[PDB]
């Protein structure tokens, strides 16, 4: 029992972190096989970042201008290419610690762990979610760029995020490992406002099921609702509309607890309309939306 | 910017996890040098756990009765001894992945990361605190025993906790790496109630400083207080009494923000007396107490 915001063990990803320096800029790189992936803005001086023409800036850079250090040892750069907003640095040595891996572009609402790094060294690991407005609410300081987000299924690491920027609002934006930004953000030091940060309804429901499984039951009520009725309330509270796909994904949680998905939707509707009344659910005074139904199942079953 | 409940990177600890089986019981072990540490209750059958005489039960066990498997390979057990509530299994091979390490007994209020494991394999990592009643609020299922808590300072892992049990209230109890339980708990399946779970005042104040550093300032008020006046309010709200030692430890946060410790105490006093009024601080609707002043400094400075 007990339910925590748990991250994946970071060891497999720690073995991939390297430091990348170009000119006066240093950030993190991800070394997989004989390729080091990093944000293309490593070629930018602080002034370049205001209005960069990455193609033009890259022309002035040769393989020897990218300094890649793995631990206390330098990697030889034998090639470089720009794919979207990431640079791919071909090195002469395959990472001996390369785990089994995939590059995956996640959907909003999906969660992942971040290994925050500085100078190619890990500082910490935390769990977060891709918000519906394609930002993440991380913990990143200057130098954290190139830090990655990932999920792990048994022995395969699926990298889903690479950190690139902080918006003026203090929220974070980044790319998948093919260098494509999540959302409309561009790697430019220009004011970019985020859209509405709606609540991930299916995740709140999964977390309510997690709460029932762990003994927190006070919020269970005598009501039920329909998807349409629930969605009228969800719209009013800036919650994502719930679909039959979300109901299907909550099936195993509904089966384990014996609480029908629509009954849990009615509990959530009452919590939205009445608030918590100073009460808590799994040590939280607000409705938690950064646990997917898969996260709840994995944590409650002990998947390794 | 951004502030997360961050855990230490778990890689150094993942390299130490092993599976220990004795009879029909399987749990986790910590392999450091040529010694494997695990909860002594691994020698217990489910019936033994009700009223175990560990000394008598251990007599019936020989080195060959403890099966230690590291990954897919078996370690040879050449010795065994019981130290308090942990077993020390001497193996014929030193763990090649042994990091620099220390065994430390932490004080209530101190935080650490837990690498939850099942069958010697890691499932996840999360950050928690030793509660003032010497319990921890973790996420542990049957088979998680032997999972460890730790802190990391640069390259040295300080192990502070080993998981042993879940109380009937769903909270967790365990030992330091010398096998001494935190608090009054015993490794017996007998009802053991926890004492008052008071709030770690110095940690709440550190988290309020973290909130100011990250832009959340709405709770800053025009008041100040004294240690004695603040402590009258803290007693009323089941908060730990604040001492000059706590004020001293908050010094660097007070200096960075320019907000005197007693002014922050006055802000906290108003938050205790008035509540949050539906507002949030660093994405939380309650006062967070599982970040130490050292955690706030480390996260806000990017220590690797
Ligand atoms: C193109 C250019 C945009 C601006 N920028 C960043 O925002 C980098 N960054 N990322 N996370 C941060 C947290 C604190 C400070 C800076 C941070 C650099 C690259
Ligand atoms: C002496 C004897 C006491 C009872 N006991 C435990 O509580 C073990 N344990 N630890 N974490 C758990 C989470 C879920 C279920 C069981 C759990 C086994 C050892």
Curated annotation (Swiss-Prot), chains A, B:
Please list the residue ranges that the record places on the Cytoplasmic side of the membrane: 1-304
Q: Which reaction does it catalyse?
A: TSAVLQ-|-SGFRK-NH2 and SGVTFQ-|-GKFKK the two peptides corresponding to the two self-cleavage sites of the SARS 3C-like proteinase are the two most reactive peptide substrates. The enzyme exhibits a strong preference for substrates containing Gln at P1 position and Leu at P2 position
What happens after mutating residue 90 to R?
In strain: Beta/B.1.351
Outcome (variant: residue 49 to A): Does not affect ability to cleave and inactivate human TRMT1
The Peptidase C30 domain is annotated at 1-304
Q: In which compartments does the protein localize?
A: Host cytoplasm; Host Golgi apparatus; Host nucleus
Protein name (database record): 3C-like proteinase nsp5
Q: Which organism is it from?
A: Severe acute respiratory syndrome coronavirus 2
